[PDB]
A paper describes a structure:
To assemble in vitro a complex of ATAD5-RFC bound to PCNA encircling dsDNA, we mixed purified ATAD5-RFC complex with PCNA that was preassembled with a 38-base-pair (bp) dsDNA in the presence of 1 mM ATPγS, a slowly hydrolyzable ATP analog, and incubated the mixture for 20 min. Two-dimensional (2D) and three-dimensional (3D) classifications resulted in an EM map at an overall resolution of 3.0 Å. We found that four subunits (ATAD5, RFC2, RFC5 and RFC4, that is, subunits A–D) each bound an ATPγS, and RFC3 (subunit E) bound ADP. The structure is devoid of DNA, suggesting that, in our reaction, PCNA unloading by ATAD5-RFC was complete upon 20-min incubation, and PCNA returned to the closed planar ring in the complex (herein referred to as planar-PCNA intermediate state 1). Indeed, we obtained a similar 3D structure to planar-PCNA intermediate state 1 by directly incubating ATAD5-RFC with free PCNA. Therefore, we propose that the closed planar-PCNA state represents a late intermediate stage in the unloading process in which ATAD5-RFC has unloaded the PCNA from DNA, and the PCNA ring has closed and is ready to dissociate from ATAD5-RFC, as explained later. In the planar-PCNA intermediate state 1, the interface is smaller (2,059 Å2): the aromatic residue Phe115 of the PIP box also inserts into the PIP-box binding cleft of PCNA-2, and Arg112 in the PIP motif forms a single H-bond with the main chain oxygen of Lys254 in PCNA-2. The RFC5 N-terminal α-helix and the α1-extension-helix move up and lose contact with PCNA-2. In the planar-PCNA intermediate state 1, the interactions involving PCNA-1 remain the same, but the N terminus of RFC5 and the shorter α-helix lose contact with PCNA-2, and no subunit is in contact with PCNA-3. As the most prevalent conformer, especially after a 20-min reaction, the planar-PCNA intermediate state 1 might be the most stable of the intermediate states.
Residue numbers in the entry:
A (entry chain C): 17 to 340
B (entry chain B): 178 to 351
C (entry chain D): 36 to 363
D (entry chain A): 1049 to 1098, 1119 to 1195, 1296 to 1418, 1451 to 1523, 1632 to 1844
E (entry chain E): 2 to 349
F (entry chain A): 868 to 971
Write the structure that this text describes.
Amino acid sequence: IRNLPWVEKYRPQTLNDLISHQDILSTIQKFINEDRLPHLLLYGPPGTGKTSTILACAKQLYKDKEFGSMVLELNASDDRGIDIIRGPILSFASTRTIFKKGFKLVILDEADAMTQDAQNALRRVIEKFTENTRFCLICNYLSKIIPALQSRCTRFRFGPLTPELMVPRLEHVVEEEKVDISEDGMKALVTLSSGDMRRALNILQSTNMAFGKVTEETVYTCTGHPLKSDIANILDWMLNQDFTTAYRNITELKTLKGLALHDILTEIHLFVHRVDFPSSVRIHLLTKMADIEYRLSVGTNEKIQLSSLIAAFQVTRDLIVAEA
Amino acid sequence: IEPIQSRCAVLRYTKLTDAQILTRLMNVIEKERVPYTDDGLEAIIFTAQGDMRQALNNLQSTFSGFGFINSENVFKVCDEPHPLLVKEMIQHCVNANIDEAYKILAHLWHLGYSPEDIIGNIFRVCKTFQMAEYLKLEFIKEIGYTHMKIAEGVNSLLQMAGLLARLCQKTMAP
Amino acid sequence: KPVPWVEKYRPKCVDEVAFQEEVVAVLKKSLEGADLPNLLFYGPPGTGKTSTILAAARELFGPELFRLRVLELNASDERGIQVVREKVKNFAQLTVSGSRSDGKPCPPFKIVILDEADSMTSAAQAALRRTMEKESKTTRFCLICNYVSRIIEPLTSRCSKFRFKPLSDKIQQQRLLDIAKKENVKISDEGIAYLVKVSEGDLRKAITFLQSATRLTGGKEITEKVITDIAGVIPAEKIDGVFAACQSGSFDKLEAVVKDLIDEGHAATQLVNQLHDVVVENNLSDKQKSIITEKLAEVDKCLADGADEHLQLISLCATVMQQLSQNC
Amino acid sequence: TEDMLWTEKYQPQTASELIGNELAIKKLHSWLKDWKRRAELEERQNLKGKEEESRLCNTVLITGPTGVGKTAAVYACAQELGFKIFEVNASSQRSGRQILSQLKEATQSHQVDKQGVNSQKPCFFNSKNATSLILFEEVDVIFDEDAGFLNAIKTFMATTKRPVILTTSDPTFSLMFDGCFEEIKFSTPSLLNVASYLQMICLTENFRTDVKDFVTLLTANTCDIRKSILYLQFWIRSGGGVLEERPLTLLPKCDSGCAETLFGLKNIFSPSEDLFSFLKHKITMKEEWHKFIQLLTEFQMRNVDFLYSNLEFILPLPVDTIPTTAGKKCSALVSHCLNSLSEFMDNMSFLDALLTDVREQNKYGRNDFSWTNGKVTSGLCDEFSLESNDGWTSQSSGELKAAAEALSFTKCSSAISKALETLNSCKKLGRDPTNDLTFYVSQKRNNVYFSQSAANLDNAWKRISVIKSVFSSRSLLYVGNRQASIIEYLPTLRNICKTEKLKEQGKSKRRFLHYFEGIHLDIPKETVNTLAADFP
Amino acid sequence: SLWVDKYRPCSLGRLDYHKEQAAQLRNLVQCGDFPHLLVYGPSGAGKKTRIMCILRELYGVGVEKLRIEHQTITTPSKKKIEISTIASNYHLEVNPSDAGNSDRVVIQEMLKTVAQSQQLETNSQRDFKVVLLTEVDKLTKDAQHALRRTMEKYMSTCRLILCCNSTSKVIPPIRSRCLAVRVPAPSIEDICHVLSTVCKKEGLNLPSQLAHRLAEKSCRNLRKALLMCEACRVQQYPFTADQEIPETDWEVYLRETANAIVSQQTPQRLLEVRGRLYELLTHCIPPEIIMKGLLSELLHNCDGQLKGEVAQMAAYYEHRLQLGSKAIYHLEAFVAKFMALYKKFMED
Amino acid sequence: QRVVHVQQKDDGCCLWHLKPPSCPLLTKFKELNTKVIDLSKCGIALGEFSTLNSKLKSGNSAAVFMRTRKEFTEEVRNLLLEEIRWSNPEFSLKKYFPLLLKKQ
Ligand SMILES: Nc1ncnc2c1ncn2[C@@H]1O[C@H](COP(=O)(O)OP(=O)(O)OP(O)(O)=S)[C@@H](O)[C@H]1O
Ligand SMILES: Nc1ncnc2c1ncn2[C@@H]1O[C@H](COP(=O)(O)OP(=O)(O)OP(O)(O)=S)[C@@H](O)[C@H]1O
Ligand SMILES: Nc1ncnc2c1ncn2[C@@H]1O[C@H](COP(=O)(O)OP(=O)(O)OP(O)(O)=S)[C@@H](O)[C@H]1O
Ligand SMILES: Nc1ncnc2c1ncn2[C@@H]1O[C@H](COP(=O)(O)OP(=O)(O)O)[C@@H](O)[C@H]1O
Ligand SMILES: [Mg+2]
Ligand SMILES: [Mg+2]
Ligand SMILES: [Mg+2]
């Protein structure tokens, strides 16, 4: 039949259905209702609600029949370069609809994939046709947009959703969907989402179809994430066993779980600050693990880097034992 | 291309010193009767790294949003990593306080700022930070090495924590 | 006109993939429903991942429709992900007709096999996620990797994950003996055992080395020497000489042994691999093992950057000699 | 009250007015004089009526670097010898049908007006007797709209009766072009000749300038004559750099300080400030640190290391031009100075290896000092690069490298100075360690203010040329390895040439001179003499 | 030509040493499934001689009919790079690392073109055309990935022979697709036998002692031993048992450089060694070879315990030399740090 | 489409069922308070993050040229020509400077 995603189904069709950003939403609505909408630069991590904000804004400005003629949406990753800025964008910005008098809107999603010369022409297109059309650029990294293009727009950082405000809407969609989750399930959802409502709804939905129960273990075996017990046992093997036993056990667990060394370093880094270590031991472990993670970027043997990771803890194991 | 450059006199424009940006900013302020503070002027000048268009855009956006020029309103308008947090993190790295420095760094990471933005703000604050010459040199060396790693593709909280641990090791080692 | 024995002797059909029970079972129940979900095969190299996905493709499709309606790309392309995005967009937009004379119609979707999917960075993985959620019904993806943890959460959440376990050495020796009996080459069981040992559980490398040795030997028996020098593996005599030079404490004979290893054409990464395997599986102390393995990782990283073999090997042997003579 | 650029105001109207490339100028002038003689003899044969030995090819080709004077020499020779230039630039649509059907008749037919103001040389576009002469300017620039242009100029080779001159700056164009033409090479002119030429044009404008500043400018823009002329026009007509009177006999003021204006260092520094005095004095102020970081950043955008290239002069150490408590205090100064110098060099190695460069080096060719790189030509199409580039990294890495280099230099300079003020105690002891603390610099790095490279690039290019000419002989042309060639074949060739020269100087048999002919090697005798000299 | 280029073997039965390896290379082409080769070993061991022998055994004698072509290739940044290529009617030969970071570019288009060449040329001799990639160990990671893609794409139409000296930089994806041919250096007896075989064809009778001296002083380099024999033939007509072998000019230059380093440890001597290394680098001598010779002669003049520290320092700065674009900086970093260590060591 | 995770469990490996470690280091977990200073409480002064100063220079810049370069007299002109000829003894100064004088 039809099982649509919960990301699409639970979409903020109106500007009042966003949950986290309220200062910039009030600012954007005040830009809407006094007819002073500027060029916008909505930037931030994915799943924060930039496309939803601009789509609700365009629904507030234009109607259904004139949506296909007054607002033009592009993805810069589909065709980069000035073959699209000088082309559809320039002709859209310079023409006028026959009977519909007002201002047009250009929604340039994924603007950071645009090349430097295409941005150098898009800024001029923005400057020359400000009254006829407004431009809203949606991007993830502000560092991949030239400052000349940034300065023509008003920036809006859509920060990751804090768990204290992300949990109520997650509980609302849990109650609406009638899903049997536990509190560790919500904790794992808001831990692996990392301020991403699309990721949260996708992981929760996929876990629900995969198991029917959404606990910590079902979430962690649904998204293919390293378990907390696995990383704790790896830390125990580095902290208590000798070199060869730890090497054998960690290699066997890596083969058994499909586990790389980059993600082992990622989880062990978070375990380093939680575990009560001295300052010198913590500094040494962080430095050694950062070097091991950098050495894995270029093509190197993962066995030798794993032995180096065990060595990084065996350097300070006897020091902690003798320190007591 | 070089044949075109051979037929033209090339004139190099350099970044505007902050005194010139301040003079133009006070010219704009006195011609618009905008209330301000020296805190806000320093914040606007920090946010515009030798870019007068960025300085004027930040000033106009701050007055359009709140009408008062102070660092709270300026850094609410621009939404960068605040230089006070970066200053406290670098100060904790100077005192080899890895826990508090990582607390600041993890707070910035959970606020969602990109690693490039964090390392740029770290370099900008440490460039004007009050410290010894040799310690500043080792700090800038580790910042540049970490930034090279960020540019090469490896960017994570592990890399920034390793940078902070290296900065603490610079203080703990002669 | 002849094909390599890796391509010639892979299983034609599903349930001919030995030592994989649950993966074959879910692939069979996907064949029965004629719908293939998004797949993610992770396991050691040479363990039957490409064989299983290709067998599913040939048995879901026709023998003449198998190569036309699947696309095998390598995800480690050096020109970013956007070029691979262009290939997936072109293959999704391009449509071909399908008709089977066996009485079963073709599925409406298509198969994109993205190999070494773990080598893609998280930004490239997030960029690919848009393509696979924008072409979900008309295109299905199978990501082939070795580490499921390198695949990001939005991808791994929407994929069906399968783990491939490596075959035992007895099974690999049996398959290699069957291959050698099929291709009519004189080889004992000892040479096949040494081949399986020198491949380290890699059946693809074992079959490649066997075919290459049959081509090189010209119809004679496969000795241990041809297998040793066709796999690039340094013999254990040179490794024992390196360790004896390190334990002796004389730098001149250390230089002599290193220069002898360099003169024989042996690689330095292979020597670092053999030295690591010797060090981590012996009776050295934990401090000695830690320092030696850290230096081995640093030397391996330096060799990967393009540094000279002789200087890195001399430095590593100096470190190993100092650590072994620290007990003296 | 002047409306002319200084390139065309001071354009050479005579072939003797051009600077440098006298052999190429003489070759082109002789070729055009022979063509003019052939035209006048044709006119005399027409008046009377109503070629291996000559070997006068119908076409010359002229190649060299940009701005050296190929077009200027062509125009001066054609003006002197009375030719009329029909110019085909890349700035007009020149496809094969148009160039043939609109300029073949200039070669094939007489000039309808042979006397008057026809000595003016026009161009070609399509939106005393004067002999016609075609000039294809910048033949390496081929567009897609110039379809069949190569076939058209090949037809111009085949069916012309008036001379054709080709101007190009691509060094490898003469390889891929098939045909018969006299090849003329324009080499880069010497520093001092162009420096005196620019001093001449400045002295015509009532300005006094020093040779060293012009030499710095010319070695900055690599002897591009037109570029230096135009920047000189901009700098002179805007009032000059700095009022400083230099009394020299070897009276008006001198006007040194043009090179610092060229690199844009005067937009950072005050007019009272001097770059050498700024770098020599100890910096403490925040504004001084900003100025140093901005200066170093402006030099890192060019991927040029300013401090290390001029390391001897900027350091507080003695510089010479190339022609027991007392013992513990003599040794400790040198040990501390060597320690600080080694620390600074380790810092520079750190910045070169483990810090990102804003311009990705060895992009189109390999690293420096290699004869295998080939030729890199600019784009000939109207399509953009369309590849992903990171602008934030290029914005931040220059400031990072500049700040780290400035801090490394300040630490090193402070360490060497805090070693150096205690040299007065050693001087009072009667022992002089300054002969060990000195720096010996070459004359090439001493006649300029500041250098962008610390090596002898002329010696490097001479070595590159002799390496190319050794391994371009037909016997050595098929050697598979290249660095192994210059590491194994070439030293043995140098030893063989040295032994052959020793045999020749010993009055031995002349057959030993034919040893390279005995093994049938085709190395030119100038190269054999070059290899036989020494290994410097 | 010289004996290194005239008396070079062309058939697989003419190779004096490595007779079992030459026989295996002879039966390699008989099956008709000739794969990509990875011919690696030390310099001058006999690699390129064996590639020419295999190429002669594959095609006819027309592989010896050689010519040189120049190809201009457009980079994706819209720039043109011109490269040289040894070519014949059946094979190709190129050094793709001559284009710097754009080696991948001359990796792609060039093999693409030669594939189309084999699509156009028909002679019913062999299905493929062999292209010889020289110095594959100097290729960047992007270049090696593009090479992997190109070998997987155009396998049926063209074949590849990768001649390198170091498989460490060569990525494991490349090594898993080409048959490995390890060519170790000839021994002292092998070099002496080849030298006597070559010298007999000139009508000259060199002694065994001179041949042993040439074999010992060449460090198992057959090309260098033959060329030193050429220099000895140039120097004297009869081959005395105590005939002086002429040493390499840059080698004695590096020797004098290292004595200059050891003798005085001052900033002035550091700048003198700076000038010496600049003048060595202007002669296109690779910085790895300079570093190896410098380290060898410094370890000649070092003490027992200092040898390991000096060697680790030299390997560190050689890796940094490979990392940096300006190798001179890391060369003088190693020289200055060694001078500081030497001055510290002799003070107590 | 429905997702599933298949991990072929082997009970003999004994790494599938892993318990939390009993060592005191991994039992007692250190707590970070996640408390940071408020950002509008301290404030920023002038010149804290830049090279700004309270004193601004005046009269040391904006100096208009307004230069009147007088024509060089004949004797000074030959003196400067002789100076350039002494600087470059191999150059042909006498055959270029009158021609450039005619060019002006
Ligand atoms: N503030 C929010 N409140 C409620 N739901 C949200 C919010 N932000 C995101 N979502 C959910 O996330 C889904 C997709 O979010 P999008 O706004 O499309 O992501 P995005 O902001 O476009 O990020 P990128 O960079 O474009 S991938 C929506 O359909 C919602 O279900
Ligand atoms: N379980 C298995 N059943 C049957 N054949 C197998 C099995 N495991 C490995 N093989 C054989 O091993 C060879 C290589 O396996 P492939 O599946 O083709 O490659 P692979 O496992 O994907 O390794 P990669 O691609 O390098 S990660 C083929 O000849 C397969 O037939
Ligand atoms: N050798 C020279 N002597 C005198 N003036 C010169 C000389 N070289 C260049 N110029 C001046 O520079 C101007 C332009 O030089 P051109 O001859 O056009 O350069 P070019 O050799 O054609 O190289 P191109 O065309 O830019 S690639 C001339 O009009 C002269 O004013
Ligand atoms: N088997 C052999 N018999 C006689 N001469 C040989 C033999 N092998 C190599 N040579 C000579 O030694 C030289 C080998 O150089 P080459 O193999 O091209 O160096 P590289 O191995 O670095 O490519 C050739 O010039 C050849 O004349
Ligand atoms: Mg979106
Ligand atoms: Mg596969
Ligand atoms: Mg010209």
